[PDB]
C-alpha cells in the first residue's frame, strides 16, 4: 500500500503537502534542495517516518455508526449537520446518496435537499420509526420510497448466506416437517390490527437488524472450526511459558595500554600496634607551614581550572549581529 519506503519516496504530492505546512523543514528544503542542488530523492531518504506520519493522519477513517439516530431535530427546530456527518449519511444509506446526486445540481441546491429529506417519510423510514399515514412527508423524496423497498430486498440477498449448523435455527424448525400441533397464541405471533394486516412494528425491528448486519459486513471489507469452539478450555493443560535462560559467564582481560613478604607485613603491623598502644598525638597532624602553602597552591590550581569551566558549563547570548 501507500505506506512503504518506495511509494512514499515517489509520492511527490504528499511530499509537497507536509513541506507546505511545516516551516523548519521547509527552510531546510529551500536551502539544500533549491540552491545547493541536493537531489529531492536523497533528501527524503532519511525522513521516511515524517512522510509516513503525515500520510497516516489523513489516511484513517472513523468506523461505521448509526448516524440518523444521533440526529435530534431539537415552531422551528434547528438540526446541526457537518461535512463528516453528511459523508457518513451517504455511506450508511446508499438510497440517500442516490436521491442526492441526481437532484442537487439539477433541480435544487444541497440545503433544500436536506431540509426536504428530514421532513420526508424516507428519513422516518430509514430511521427505525413507524411511518404514520397522517404525516404529509415530502413530494420529491416520497417517490424514492419504492426504490428503497427494492434496495431492502437487494440488501437482504446481499446478506443472505448459508449458516453453520451450530447456530442454524432454520433446520431446528424443519427437523420434523410434519409437526401439526396447536397454533401458538397471538402473544407468540407478530401483532396485527382489526383488518388482519400487519401493524408495521416488525419492519422497524428488521430495519435495525439490517443496519447492524450492514455495519459488520462493512468492517470485513477488502481492506473443523466448530471443533475448537465446543471444547472446554479450562480442563486443558495450563499454558507453559517457553522463555529462554542465559547463564552469563563473566571473565574479561585486565585493562592494558615491589611485593612485600609476610614477615615484612607482620613487622609493620607490629609497628603500628606499638605506636598506637604507646601513645597517639593528634597535635602532630598540623603541617609544618612549608607543605601547607604547597598544599593550598595545588588545590587552588585545580579550583581555578574548574571555576573557569564551571562558569559557562534557549541559545546563549551572542555578540554577533
Amino acid at each position: 500500500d501507500s505506506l512503504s519506503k518506495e511509494k512514499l519516496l515517489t509520492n511527490l504530492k504528499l511530499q509537497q503537502s507536509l513541506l507546505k505546512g511545516n516551516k523548519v523543514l521547509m527552510k531546510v528544503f529551500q536551502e539544500t534542495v533549491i540552491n545547493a542542488g541536493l537531489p529531492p530523492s536523497e533528501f527524503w531518504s532519511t525522513r521516511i517516518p515524517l512522510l509516513r506520519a503525515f500520510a497516516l493522519s489523513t489516511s484513517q477513517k472513523v468506523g461505521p455508526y448509526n448516524v440518523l439516530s444521533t440526529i435530534k431535530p431539537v415552531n422551528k427546530v434547528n438540526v446541526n449537520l457537518s461535512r463528516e456527518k453528511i459523508l457518513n449519511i451517504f455511506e450508511n444509506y446508499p438510497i440517500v446518496k442516490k436521491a442526492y446526486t441526481d437532484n442537487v445540481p439539477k433541480n435544487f441546491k444541497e440545503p433544500e435537499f436536506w431540509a426536504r429529506f428530514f421532513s420526508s417519510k424516507l428519513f422516518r423510514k430509514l430511521r427505525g420509526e413507524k411511518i404514520m399515514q397522517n404525516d404529509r412527508g415530502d413530494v420529491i423524496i416520497d417517490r424514492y420510497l419504492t426504490l428503497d423497498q427494492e434496495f431492502d430486498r437487494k440488501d437482504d440477498d446481499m446478506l443472505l448466506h448459508p449458516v453453520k449448523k451450530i447456530i442454524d435455527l432454520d433446520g431446528n424448525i424443519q427437523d420434523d416437517p410434519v409437526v401439526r400441533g396447536n397454533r401458538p397464541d397471538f402473544t407468540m405471533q407478530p401483532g396485527v390490527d382489526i383488518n388482519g394486516n400487519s401493524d408495521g412494528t416488525v419492519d422497524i425491528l428488521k430495519g435495525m437488524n439490517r443496519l447492524s448486519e450492514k455495519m459488520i459486513m462493512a468492517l470485513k471489507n477488502e481492506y473443523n472450526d466448530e471443533r475448537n469452539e465446543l471444547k472446554i478450555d479450562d480442563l486443558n493443560e495450563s499454558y507453559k511459558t517457553n522463555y529462554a535462560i542465559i547463564h552469563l559467564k563473566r571473565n574479561a582481560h585486565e585493562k592494558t595500554t615491589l611485593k612485600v613478604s609476610n614477615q615484612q607485613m607482620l613487622q609493620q603491623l607490629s609497628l603500628v600496634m606499638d605506636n598506637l598502644i604507646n601513645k597517639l598525638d593528634l597535635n602532630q597532624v598540623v603541617p609544618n607551614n612549608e607543605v601547607s602553602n604547597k598544599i593550598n597552591k595545588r588545590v587552588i590550581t585545580a579550583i581555578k581550572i574548574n571555576a573557569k569551566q564551571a562558569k559557562h558549563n534557549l541559545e546563549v547570548k551572542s555578540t554577533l549581529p
Binding site: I166, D168, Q174, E226, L235
Partner: protein, 112 residues
C-alpha cells in the same frame, strides 16, 4: 485422562476433570447397573456432554452386552454439538488405545 470406576475403565478427553463430572459419571453408572430411570441436574458450567459420552461409550465398549446408546436432544443444533463432542472423544480414545475401535455414530434429521 484414563481413570477407573469400580470395574469400568473410562477415558476422559481432557487432562483435568471437575468433581461434578466424576459424581455425574458415578451416578449414571449406578443407574445403568441397577436398572431403571433416573433424573440428574448438573450445572451448565460443568462439562456435561463429555461426561455422558465418555462413560456411556466406555460402558458399551467394556461390558459383554455391548448395549447401544440413544441420545435424544431437542433441536438439530444440539445434535451437532453432541456429535462434535463424540468425535473428540473417539479421536482421543484412538490416540490412547492405539487403534480405531469398531465404532459407528451418526446423527439423524429431516431431508431438508
Amino acid at each position: 485422562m484414563k481413570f477407573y470406576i469400580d470395574d469400568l475403565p473410562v477415558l476422559f478427553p481432557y487432562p483435568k476433570i471437575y468433581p461434578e463430572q466424576y459424581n455425574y459419571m458415578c451416578d449414571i453408572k449406578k443407574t445403568l447397573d441397577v436398572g431403571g430411570n433416573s433424573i440428574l441436574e448438573m450445572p451448565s458450567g460443568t462439562g456435561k456432554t463429555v461426561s455422558l459420552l465418555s462413560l456411556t461409550i466406555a460402558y458399551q465398549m467394556h461390558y459383554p452386552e455391548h448395549r447401544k446408546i440413544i441420545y435424544c436432544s431437542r433441536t438439530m443444533s444440539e445434535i451437532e454439538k453432541a456429535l462434535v463432542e463424540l468425535e473428540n472423544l473417539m479421536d482421543y480414545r484412538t490416540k490412547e488405545l492405539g487403534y480405531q475401535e469398531d465404532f459407528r455414530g451418526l446423527g439423524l434429521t429431516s431431508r431438508k
